[PDB]
Design a protein that fits this description.
Two copies of one chain form a homodimer. Helix content of chain A is about 35%, strand content about 25%. By secondary structure, chain A is α/β, with parallel strands linked by helices. Chain A is globular, with a radius of gyration of 18 Å. Chain A folds into two domains: about 140 residues, ornithine cyclodeaminase, domain 1, CATH 3.30.1780; about 160 residues, Rossmann fold (3-Layer(aba) Sandwich). In chain A, about 55% of the residues are buried. Chains A and B meet through strand 3, strand 4, strand 5 and strand 6 of A and strand 3, strand 4, strand 5 and strand 6 of B. The structure holds NADPH dihydro-nicotinamide-adenine-dinucleotide phosphate (2 copies). The site of one NADPH dihydro-nicotinamide-adenine-dinucleotide phosphate (NDP) has 24 residues of chain B, from helix 3 and helix 4. Chain A: Belongs to the ornithine cyclodeaminase/mu-crystallin family.
Chain lengths: ~300, ~300
């Protein structure tokens, strides 16, 4: 019995709303951070660079006992969407390949879903203003769930090329104030989302409102950065994975910042959410997050 | 852009002649052993323990600049023991071109790489071949070794003699079934170990001076097929030093010195001591899976 293939449109049908992903992801992150008592086996992501094409192949395997599912997501990103992904789903009991599915929409919706979880815990009292840095796939996915989950009075956006932000602004529903600089976009912003593939810092702490929350999603490479030192050093730093951040996050590696806690620890109440101080959630993506989503799809697909 | 799926039989048809599999395997091994300047990017394999089901998931990604190929092998082994899938990507844009069964590929390249080491390291007058084990790898090894070499006597030992006899009357030529490892390896010139043994079964005291051993089995850091004596007194060749020092219980638990990588011998950097007793420890490498995958895909897309 050959494995089933699930198209991008097959997946989204059996995926449904991005915020429906939230409670299972909350469980996955907590289980992960619980370590040996959490049932999650997840080594740090293996990345092989394709220098000849300025690209990378990410391989993210995971087993999760609670979901009893065995997965591997393979993602290529190059500096045809920039990010291409496929998820493999195995029978954890015998090991046969069950399904090969398009991983792009899972990646987009799950990443947005995790940022929202961290945002819900860490956004300051009186979070009226949201700012989005970037205008790619993740920006759309984050915009959809953040306007769904939260109630911002104003949304700002900056992109490297202003045309794509204005395009973004006119495509999405609801008003978007396109700003020509990051300084303008984040000034007075209570929640900031950085979803660019920049490699040198675009976000400087001096522009950041005291107590603001930052979701740093991009710069998933040891030599890449989105944030400067002042922000990385002065803010309370949360990550999805401590082992992954110390190996793959240039924002963490180069700044020399102390990781305060893993987001899963907070979810379980093992660590506090300092919503009143300036916070940074540095997200690098974890295989267990993909696991949960792909498991939801196949199970739906099977019924 | 839905990926292609090649069945095991489909892969099996694209890999008929070994006379097309070994030359690119040799080239790949040569380039790998050169390090990064050789153009092969191959992280040590990641293994996910699934003790909950007494099983493992092996993950083996690779890129090669020389043939511009980007692949990932995903192997699962449980207690068909080994189930593999090989993914082939487009290097320039990252799209997944194909998903193929990787059990046939695994069997083929493993047997072929062993034959490459054997062709180089077998002693003068190699008349007796000895196979320890009777699984998938024993078959694939037997087919290529009898095609490539010319032994007068082929022997086999297996933990379950029933399986050894089923092997003996399935393969074409005459295989002599033995009731002990010592009986099988005594006087043997080439020895192939493809067992799931976790504690030493092959002992240096039994091994003919000058014999070549292809140790393929034990690929977990606490499992081993060969004893301290043999590991330390033979000239030790591996596919990868980095994998060996991580995953080979045979090498780690004996403190044995690695003389060379196989690619180093193919390239000319290190000599093939065919007159000394030699051991080639194969752990399996992502680039070997890559080579086969590209060969299959090139033929398939023609
Ligand atoms: N943490 C996680 O879980 C995951 C993280 N990501 C990361 O997030 C980022 C966005 O992903 P995605 O939306 O799919 O990619 P996209 O290609 O769809 O979007 C790229 C965005 O980043 C901008 N960009 C590219 N280079 C630069 C640069 N040098 N400087 C400033 N902006 C730049 C682009 O702007 P422009 O219009 O000028 O091209 C665009 O706004 C990536 O870096 C990705 O690696 C996504 C996967 C999940
Ligand atoms: N180096 C490489 O490139 C790769 C290495 N391998 C490794 O090679 C070995 C064989 O692979 P494969 O043929 O596919 O596996 P199989 O399941 O097809 O065959 C298993 C063989 O090992 C024997 N065996 C099981 N337990 C023991 C034991 N305690 N002692 C001695 N023999 C035992 C079995 O005998 P019985 O008849 O009793 O079952 C059988 O002969 C494995 O260890 C595998 O991990 C395979 C992938 C490629």
């Amino acid at each position: 019995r050959a494995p089933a293939f699930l198209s991008a449109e097959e997946v989204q049908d059996h995926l449904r709303s991005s915020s429906l992903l939230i409670p299972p992801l909350e469980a996955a992150l907590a289980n992960f951070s619980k370590g040996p008592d959490g049932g999650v086996m997840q080594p740090v992501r293996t990345v092989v660079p394709v220098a000849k094409h300025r690209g990378f192949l990410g391989v993210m395997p995971a087993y999760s006992a609670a979901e009893d599912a065995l997965t591997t997501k393979l993602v290529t990103f190059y500096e045809v969407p920039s990010h291409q992904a496929s998820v493999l789903l195995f029978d954890p009991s015998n090991g046969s390949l069950l399904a090969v599915m398009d991983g792009n929409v899972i990646t987009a919706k799950r990443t947005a879903a995790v940022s929202a979880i961290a945002t819900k815990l860490l956004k300051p009292p009186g979070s009226d203003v949201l700012c989005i840095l970037g205008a790619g796939v993740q920006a759309y996915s984050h915009y959809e769930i953040f306007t769904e989950q939260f109630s911002f009075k104003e949304v700002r956006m900056w992109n490297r090329t202003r045309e794509n932000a204005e395009k973004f602004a006119s495509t999405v529903q609801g008003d978007v104030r396109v700003c020509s600089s990051v300084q303008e976009a984040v000034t007075g912003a209570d929640v900031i989302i950085t979803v660019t593939m920049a490699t040198e810092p675009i976000l400087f702490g001096e522009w950041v409102k005291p107590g603001a929350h930052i979701n740093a999603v991009g710069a998933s490479r040891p030599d890449w950065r989105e944030l400067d030192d002042e922000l990385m050093r002065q803010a309370v730093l949360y990550v999805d994975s401590r082992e992954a951040a110390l190996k793959e996050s240039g924002d963490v590696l180069l700044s020399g910042a102390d990781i305060f806690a893993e987001l899963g620890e907070v979810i379980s109440g093992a660590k506090p959410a300092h919503c009143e101080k300036t916070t940074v959630f540095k997200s690098l993506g974890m295989a267990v997050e993909d696991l949960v989503a792909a498991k939801l799809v196949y199970d739906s697909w099977s019924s």
